[PDB]
Amino acid sequence: KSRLMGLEALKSHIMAAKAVANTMRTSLGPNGLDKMMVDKDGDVTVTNDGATILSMMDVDHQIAKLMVELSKSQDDEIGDGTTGVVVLAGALLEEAEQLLDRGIHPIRIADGYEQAARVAIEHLDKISDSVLVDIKDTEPLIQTAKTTLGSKVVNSCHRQMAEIAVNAVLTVADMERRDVDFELIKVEGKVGGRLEDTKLIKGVIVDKDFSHPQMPKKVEDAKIAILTCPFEPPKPKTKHKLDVTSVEDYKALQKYEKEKFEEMIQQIKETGANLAICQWGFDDEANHLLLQNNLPAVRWVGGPEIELIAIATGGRIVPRFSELTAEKLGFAGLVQEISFGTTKDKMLVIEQCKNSRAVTIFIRGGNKMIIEEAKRSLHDALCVIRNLIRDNRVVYGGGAAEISCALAVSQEADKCPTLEQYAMRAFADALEVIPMALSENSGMNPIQTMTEVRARQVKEMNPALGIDCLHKGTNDMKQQHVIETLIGKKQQISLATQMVRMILKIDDIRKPGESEE
């Protein structure tokens, strides 16, 4: 193997970092552009969100992967900011190289970059500081939602998606809990729908339907028998199997399994139920007994999936048929199969007018790509809105905020005596990378766009005026309603510095080559 140190170490780091940064910058913001990429599987995957791009690519060098991990934590915490964090990171490394050839050591760069980002978080704290009750939040929240949904491409008739999301963060969450609720949130997508229909499911959906249409399409409030019992083959982990031969053993078996299935239906119905959810579903044979002792049932529920339905409804468990009682039965308001807007979408809902401790956000779209795109718009949208329900502190994106901060950092950069001063000013140009890269997306030259925004930040010292981010020929960020959470941008700025600071610190590299994954 080879020992890479110093210049060898930092040269490699720019080469790896940039490759990721270039795709992200050309997919940045609501003026952002779709990237149609092919795998070696003959398939085609159409992406735009920064996280899916990181999952897709396995480009050389460790530095690629370190950005991948970083983005994943942030999808849960903030949501969006996935494109933004990585493009800002590569800007730091381009500037560091400019200062590195001048003769500046990377530890100088490292401390001054960390110190500059603290100037910027203080600037961004000024813009809002409001925390308001949940009802009042709902109009600002919907305006934020447009933007976020817009940065996964298209946002026209996507106003349902925003209005269902305010309900979705409220139910699962408290106002000052200060914890995550996206493991309580189930995202669901099914092909054949529309992007113009978005529904809020205050229970849970199983993709399964009734065993017969002849069985009733309504079931009472509560009385759900949660079961692990077979009415079809359960596929046993036992071993050597044997089959029936001839007419006589065939007949004996058939009458046996029919006899046992009728006894089972009766004991469920006696302890009080009108919905059987059974792990191992229903056979053609089993249908006959179940209509005859009349009890709606769902055929098949996954092994783990049965747990997820229990916690969500708050219902009280019954593990198995061996464990039947009338003191423990699950919760419902109604059990009915729902046709959303088409008969191509058939999900069967166990919906709650009782306790709900999870929310299923059911979004539809007519084809595979359309649901993919819609799920990722909506989850990220939900997450940014959860930061804002708690504390409704809002800043206007589009790079306006960054320009103001760039002015603030650049001044504060030079008023310290230490050798960091040069780093700190490069930090100010590095914040500017984001309206510069937005411009590439807009259809505008990178350079003059930033300096138009800048004059307007010399006046106010607040983002609410800027340039185009939807494209409509306005010079406003408050008549465009381009809005991101305050914690969210603050998060892209602090995370990116924290990460790149490890990368400047490490110049001790054992690779044979220059990169290994």
């Binding site: 552009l33 149609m36 990429m37 795998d39 480009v59 029936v244 007419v247 065939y250 259809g443 494209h471």
Partner: protein, 508 residues
């Protein structure tokens, strides 16, 4: 991983789509060039193609931009009708003009918004040029004949075209909207008629009826079932084991013959003399059915049966143990006819109403399949003309008109997209140049004069480029409906734009 960088991704995107583009552009418009597809990599053959569906699917895509477009256009052909040639050619022509833009250095979003606003201008101008010709229903019939006539030609058919104009117009007209593979079911067979197609009154089924089962059934009552035995039925007293030594191999085969007789008694109970099963059995099982006197008609079609069910009030649905579960269909005679020189069992008793069956006769299977696809696209265009009975004059006359209107607005309206609005207009006019030189007229001269004429209000005169001349399109009939063109334009602009947006391709 592999990273194909910012210039290079866009270059792959342009050449790939251009190459596939040039295959469907020859057939498109009036008679010019055709494709004869050369097959050697799957199998060694030559194929006579004229439909865009065949050309585009059969040749793979291994250029990543190329994949997206062939999938969008194929679905448009099903719905819209003639979306295969139309969507692909225009999408390709737009990328050519992107190539220009980009080297010059215009940003991809200027191009994307210029093309898009220009699509909105084209659509508004197509609405302007389109006017009704379905204000009396007999006048409506005639409007539909023109539209139909246009689709059918410039697709190789010998004399099956002449029938189809009248056929498609009849089928659509009576039904009003919707699909029309339910109002005319396409049974394809070879006959002694070289390229003739007619309207059957009944449903006729190919297969000879031999043996003791009689060829003439009188007083049919049909029991409809969609499943049945493949050739052997398994059941309660059907399940046995009789095989475990080498001589016991013939004994089980004996036994399977017996299982055939068990299925016969199932129908015998119903007392329904005509049982239809969708699958074919063999000649030997047939003797059992015919003997009992509950006749099995095998190799039945779903489409045929559906034709009878609608007029009689029967139901097409499985489950049989009694005939009260599944409603009955009727015919008088199911009589063995010979049509062509092939012997057919022909159901006759009901005629028309909600469905007809159309029997095509050729001598090659290729002719039937080719004929169906031509026809198919036509029926779809005519489906849309019932809803919006506007019609707009084409042949390349439409495409220049919208382009003139887009050039006028291209100067006035935008702040930076001027260059791109014009590029959109020039790409519509690319289609009428290519066909000019196949015809024996000068491309340059055609696009530069009549364009001002038709725009000023001579919408009738348009491009007749199967002779290289200016002809009336109201009298010559090279006019297609408003709907079909509006949707393929929409589609093609979106498709180009999608792949124009792509500045890096990563391959993992």
């Amino acid at each position: 991983a592999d990273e194909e960088r910012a210039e290079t991704a866009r270059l792959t995107s342009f050449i790939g789509a251009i190459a596939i583009g040039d295959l469907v552009k020859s057939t498109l418009g009036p008679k010019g060039m055709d494709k004869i597809l050369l097959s050697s990599g799957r199998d060694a053959s030559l194929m006579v193609t004229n439909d865009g569906a065949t050309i585009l699917k059969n040749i793979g895509v291994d250029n990543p931009a190329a994949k997206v477009l062939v999938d969008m256009s194929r679905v448009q052909d099903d719905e819209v009708g003639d979306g295969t040639t139309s969507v692909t050619v225009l999408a390709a022509e737009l990328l050519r003009e992107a190539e220009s833009l980009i080297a010059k250095k215009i940003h991809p979003q200027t191009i994307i918004a210029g093309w898009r606003e220009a699509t909105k201008a084209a659509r508004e101008a197509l609405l302007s040029s389109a006017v009704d010709h379905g204000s009396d229903e007999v006048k409506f019939r005639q409007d539909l004949m023109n539209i139909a006539g246009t689709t059918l030609s410039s697709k190789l058919l010998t004399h099956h075209k002449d029938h189809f104009t009248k056929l498609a117009v009849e089928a659509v007209l009576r039904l009003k909207g919707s699909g029309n593979l339910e109002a005319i079911h396409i049974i394809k067979k070879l006959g002694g008629s070289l390229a003739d197609s007619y309207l059957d009154e009944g449903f006729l089924l190919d297969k000879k009826i031999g043996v003791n089962q009689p060829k003439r059934i009188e007083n049919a009552k049909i029991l409809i079932a969609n499943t049945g035995m493949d050739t052997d039925k398994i059941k309660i007293f059907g399940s046995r084991v009789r095989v475990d030594s080498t001589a016991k191999v013939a004994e089980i085969e004996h036994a399977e013959k017996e299982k055939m007789k068990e299925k016969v008694e199932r129908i015998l109970k119903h007392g329904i003399n005509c049982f239809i099963n969708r699958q074919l059995i063999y000649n030997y099982p047939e003797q059992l059915f015919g003997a009992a006197g509950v006749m099995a008609i095998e190799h039945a079609d779903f489409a045929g049966v559906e034709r009878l069910a609608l007029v009689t009030g029967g139901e097409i649905a499985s489950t049989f143990d009694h005939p009260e579960l599944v409603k009955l269909g009727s015919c008088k005679l199911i009589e063995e006819v010979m049509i062509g020189e092939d012997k057919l069992i022909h159901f006759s008793g009901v005629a028309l109403g909600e469905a007809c069956t159309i029997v095509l006769r050729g001598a090659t299977q290729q002719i039937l399949d080719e004929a169906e696809r031509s026809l198919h696209d036509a029926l779809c265009v005519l489906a849309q003309t019932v809803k919006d009975s506007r019609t707009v004059y084409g042949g390349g006359c439409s495409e220049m008109l919208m382009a003139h209107a887009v050039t006028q607005l291209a100067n006035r309206t935008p702040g930076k997209e001027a260059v791109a609005m014009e590029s959109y207009a020039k790409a519509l006019r690319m289609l009428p140049t290519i066909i000019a030189d196949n015809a024996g007229y000068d491309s340059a001269d055609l696009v530069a004069q009549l364009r001002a004429a038709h725009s000023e209000g001579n919408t009738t005169a348009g491009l007749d480029m199967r002779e290289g001349t200016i002809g009336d399109m109201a009298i010559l009939g090279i006019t297609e409906s408003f709907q079909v063109k509006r949707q393929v334009l929409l589609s093609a602009a979106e498709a180009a734009e999608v792949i124009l947006r792509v500045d890096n391709i990563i391959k993992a």
